[PDB]
Write a protein that binds this ligand. Structure first.
Ligand SMILES: NC(=O)c1ccc[n+]([C@@H]2O[C@H](COP(=O)([O-])OP(=O)(O)OC[C@H]3O[C@@H](n4cnc5c(N)ncnc54)[C@H](OP(=O)(O)O)[C@@H]3O)[C@@H](O)[C@H]2O)c1
Ligand SMILES: CCOc1ccc2c(c1)C[C@H](C(=O)N(C)Cc1cc(C(=O)O)c(C)o1)CO2
Length: 319
């Protein structure tokens, strides 16, 4: 196992456990599989208000601390501010609510989940009389200032963003009176959308790029086009898996580790959870890495097409 030093001095494990499951999956499963992830050796756990599972992920962490399996300081726990809470006065209460649900005193990392602000309220997806999601206009620099106060108050050890493009990152980085840079930008990133340009920008600013959907997403019909290619069926990934006597998933994860990306992996399957930790057991050659670099096709599993008219839609730019 390994960590990366963040630009605020804290350390983030380079392999993280993804916890999202669709609402049809019983919440008891998130409890069970987070315990299995910790037993397998995951120390970085990625949750969010949106996932409706912080209560269970927190219970799993509590249970493994009481086991003597880990200490709280050994676990890197991420939560995320949902887009209906971007107005600055709502940020600290949202974080406090997440902490209360997880029964934790602090999160290791708090992220702005998305730059696309939504109408404030308890509903996650507020909609108007014609069924359209109601956007909000919020200066994300004021949201960031509220995030900074959460770090000063000790409720988040580190703060970062998610789904930001380069221009959106620069707006934070160029903010007058900035106190804390975002430590990371959690974005969709895999061999079919490898974010090389955004990665280079983040590296130049000492911002860690954290990859989600690194195994090609859960392909839920509600949010992912069923005709998109399946990442783990890719011939190059499968040929490399055979060459290294690994699996295409492990190739996809190891690819990110070797280009300096922190990688998340969701699994609710005991054997695949344990398999994913084997990413540390082998290395891709330089030739292998160039072959995978060749797979990019700017394919967004989470394209959020119905939000393409949002002013902060991140894919309005080249990157
Ligand atoms: N910031 C954001 O907006 C955002 C957006 C998307 C995701 N995320 C985070 O990133 C996490 C991961 O992304 P994701 O949920 O899209 O899924 P993912 O990591 O890309 O995984 C996709 C699928 O791969 C399967 N899988 C896992 N290990 C495997 C293996 N060794 N061999 C074959 N298949 C394997 C899993 O199925 P099984 O469960 O059946 O094993 C999973 O459903 C999420 O859970 C969430 O924490 C954040
Ligand atoms: C601010 C943007 O505006 C909105 C408004 C409503 C809305 C969304 C975005 C996105 C939601 C969605 O895509 N869900 C729940 C599937 C999913 C999310 C994640 C994750 O990890 O994040 C994963 C792995 O899957 C749908 O509900």
């Amino acid at each position: 196992h390994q960590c990366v030093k963040l630009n605020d001095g804290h350390f983030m494990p380079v392999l993280g456990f993804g916890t999202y499951a669709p609402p049809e999956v019983p919440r008891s499963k998130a409890l069970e599989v987070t315990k299995l992830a910790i037993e397998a050796g995951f120390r970085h756990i990625d949750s969010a208000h949106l996932y409706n599972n912080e209560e269970q992920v927190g219970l799993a962490i509590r249970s493994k601390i009481a086991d003597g399996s880990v200490k709280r300081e050994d676990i890197f726990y991420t939560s995320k501010l949902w887009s209906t809470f971007h107005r600055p006065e709502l940020v600290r209460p949202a974080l406090e609510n997440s902490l209360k649900k997880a029964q934790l005193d602090y999160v290791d990392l708090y992220l702005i989940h998305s730059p696309m602000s939504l109408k404030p309220g308890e509903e996650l997806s507020p909609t108007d009389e014609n069924g359209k999601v109601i956007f909000d206009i919020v200066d994300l620099c004021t949201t960031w200032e509220a995030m900074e106060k959460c770090k000063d108050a000790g409720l988040a050890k580190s703060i970062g963003v998610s789904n930001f493009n380069r221009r959106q990152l620069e707006m934070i980085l160029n903010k007058p009176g900035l106190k804390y840079k975002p430590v990371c930008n959690q974005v969709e990133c895999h061999p079919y959308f490898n974010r090389s340009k955004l990665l280079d920008f983040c590296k130049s600013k000492d911002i860690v790029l954290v990859a989600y959907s690194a195994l090609g997403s859960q392909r839920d019909k509600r949010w992912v086009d069923p005709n998109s290619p399946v990442l783990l069926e890719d011939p190059v990934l499968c040929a490399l898996a055979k060459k290294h006597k690994r699996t295409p998933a492990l190739i996809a994860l190891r690819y990110q580790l070797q280009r300096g990306v922190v990688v998340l992996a969701k699994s609710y399957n005991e054997q695949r959870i344990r398999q994913n930790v084997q990413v540390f057991e082998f290395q891709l050659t330089a030739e292998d890495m160039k072959a995978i670099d060749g797979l990019d096709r700017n394919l967004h599993y989470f394209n959020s097409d119905s939000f393409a008219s949002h002013p902060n839609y991140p894919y309005s730019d080249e990157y």
